[PDB]
Each structure stands twice: as C-alpha cells, then as structure tokens.
C-alpha cells in the first residue's frame, strides 16, 4: 500500500550542476510502453 | 485529509523491507501525476487521505490521480532543461541538461541522458519558466550501458 511524501517545490534553480550529453537515437515504442533501440 | 500543495513528492511502499521509494510524482491543481509503472494504477495514501486513479495509459506510461492530466508545457526543441531528480533517500536536486532526441515512426521526442535509480521514475523535467514539460523514467539502455529517458508528457483536455 503506497503513500506520498512532499519532497520540494518545482522551481528552475540558477547555477544547477550542468551535465549529461544530447544523443539522437532511433527508438521503437511497444504496446507494453517499453522503448527499444532500432539499429 | 490530505496534503494537496503543489510540488514534487516521493511515492513510497511498506510492502517490501522497511519503507522503499518506488518513484516520484507532481502535484498540480489538485491532481497527482506519475508514471504508470510506479503505481500500476493502485490507489495512494496522503496521510489519512485517499488518492484514486482517474486516467492512465500503459503505453504512454502515465497516470493521474483525483482528476484529468493537467501538465501541458512542451520542450521548445532548442533550450537546456532541468531534471528535478528525487533519488531514493536523497534530497531533491536540479540538474541542467540539453536534451537529445528519440526518433520514432510516430515522430520525434525529447530525451534526457541522466542515469538515476529506477526509484527516481516520475521526477519532473522543467523549462526556464519552471513549467513541467514531462516526466523522467521511461527510456532505454544504450551501447554504453547508460540510461536515456523520454521527456514523457500527457495531453490536457
Ligand atoms: O523501471 C524502469 N523502467 C520501467 C519499468 N517498467 N516500465 C518501465 C518503462 N516502460 C514502462 C514499464 C527502469 C529500469 C532501468 C533504469 C531506469 N532508470 C530510470 C527510470 C526507470 C528505469
């Protein structure tokens, strides 16, 4: 039995950690809501 | 009866060892938004309050509680965004990234290349105006072994 707990406000924060890259991927989305790589 | 304040929230279970974080969601205009695989459409407690599922779709991998999906902002296809990541047992933390692209036969989707525990599923992605443009948690493992999430957004009616 699941419950919720507040964890913060939804706000843009100036000078957050800037990280990760920006890849262009060919993907398929199946009926069970699972993405997969077309290749 | 219940906590209705806007903001990000942890989704917890007591059904396993101790209290386990299964995911994250967004409270906006009285509606709770999370990913379907987090709750599988089950009801939620907020203190003595009950939250009932209202709308959901296993293929979009989204669900809304107490009302229709409210979040309609979209990635503009150009600007950097912030994952407001809420990892299990750790404080909410903004991370700024330039999204990549998922190319599908039904068209192009924003994608965030940021790896976090599955219990982070449901964490919101924000524009510079603080508007939720989608949720993190539905995506793919790449050749690297790393994880890339769709910017998953519902429809407002
Ligand atoms: O639990 C994950 N994903 C999941 C589970 N059921 N479903 C999905 C996505 N399609 C719908 C059904 C997951 C697996 C590995 C890494 C992750 N990283 C960040 C968020 C989530 C995951």
């Amino acid at each position: 039995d699941m419950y919720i707990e507040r964890a913060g406000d939804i706000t843009w924060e100036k000078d957050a950690e800037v990280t990760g890259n920006s890849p262009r991927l060919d993907v398929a989305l199946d009926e069970s809501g699972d993405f997969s790589l077309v290749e | 009866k219940g906590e209705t304040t806007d903001g990000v929230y942890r989704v917890m279970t007591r059904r396993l060892l101790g209290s386990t974080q299964v995911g994250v969601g967004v409270m906006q205009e009285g509606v709770f938004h999370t990913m379907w695989h987090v709750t599988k459409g089950a009801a939620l407690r907020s203190g003595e309050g009950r939250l009932d599922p209202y709308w959901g779709d296993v293929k979009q991998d989204l669900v809304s509680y107490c009302g229709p999906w409210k979040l309609d902002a979209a990635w503009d296809g150009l600007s950097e965004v912030q994952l407001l990541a809420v990892p299990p047992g750790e404080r909410a933390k903004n991370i700024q990234t330039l999204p990549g692209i998922f190319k599908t036969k039904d068209g192009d989707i924003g994608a965030v290349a940021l790896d976090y525990p599955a219990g982070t599923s449901g964490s919101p992605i924000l524009d510079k105006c603080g508007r939720v443009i989608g949720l993190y948690g539905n995506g793919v493992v790449i050749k690297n072994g790393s994880y890339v999430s769709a910017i998953t957004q519902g429809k407002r009616e």
Side-chain angles (χ1 to χ4, degrees):
Chain A
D1 184 285
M2 305 193 161
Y3 58 96
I4 57 160
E5 283 174 351
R6 193 175 197 278
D9 296 5
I10 298 167
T11 72
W12 182 275
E13 293 291 299
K14 277 163 188 136
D15 298 289
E17 194 158 69
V18 184
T19 189
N21 49 302
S22 314
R24 298 176 197 274
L25 298 178
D26 293 321
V27 305
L29 179 67
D30 83 357
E31 196 191 70
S32 313
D34 293 340
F35 285 104
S36 61
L37 295 158
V38 179
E39 272 270 31
Chain B
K1 289 188 175 178
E3 196 174 19
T4 325
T5 316
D6 281 13
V8 63
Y9 290 64
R10 299 178 193 270
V11 184
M12 306 300 296
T13 186
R14 297 249 184 68
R15 213 187 32 86
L16 268 47
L17 191 77
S19 297
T20 300
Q21 181 173 314
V22 289
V24 180
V26 177
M27 191 68 82
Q28 179 163 142
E29 313 158 43
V31 174
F32 193 63
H33 310 73
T34 189
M35 312 227 90
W36 180 277
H37 78 247
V38 170
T39 66
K40 325 270 199 238
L44 303 172
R45 181 164 49 80
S46 168
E48 274 297 314
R50 199 184 166 124
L51 296 203
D52 294 321
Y54 184 101
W55 171 80
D57 193 281
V58 162
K59 180 167 176 197
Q60 301 180 48
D61 189 25
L62 293 176
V63 55
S64 76
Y65 287 78
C66 306
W69 190 269
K70 298 286 163 110
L71 311 183
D72 54 353
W75 184 40
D76 63 3
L78 280 170
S79 12
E80 296 205 341
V81 307
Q82 295 195 349
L83 174 61
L84 170 31
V86 180
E90 307 184 342
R91 191 143 60 253
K93 187 200 22 190
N94 293 63
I95 311 290
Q96 180 158 321
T97 192
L98 182 84
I101 307 279
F102 275 7
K103 280 148 147 144
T104 88
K105 71 184 219 304
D106 289 13
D108 281 8
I109 339 190
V112 145
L114 291 176
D115 221 308
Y116 281 108
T120 309
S121 285
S123 286
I125 301 155
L126 319 184
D127 65 23
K128 285 145 193 195
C129 285
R131 281 177 305 147
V132 187
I133 56 166
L135 307 186
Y136 168 98
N138 196 20
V140 80
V141 191
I142 58 186
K143 325 225 315 176
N144 313 29
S146 53
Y147 182 82
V148 185
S149 172
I151 312 168
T152 309
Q153 191 51 298
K155 183 145 188 264
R156 192 189 175 113
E157 295 263 300

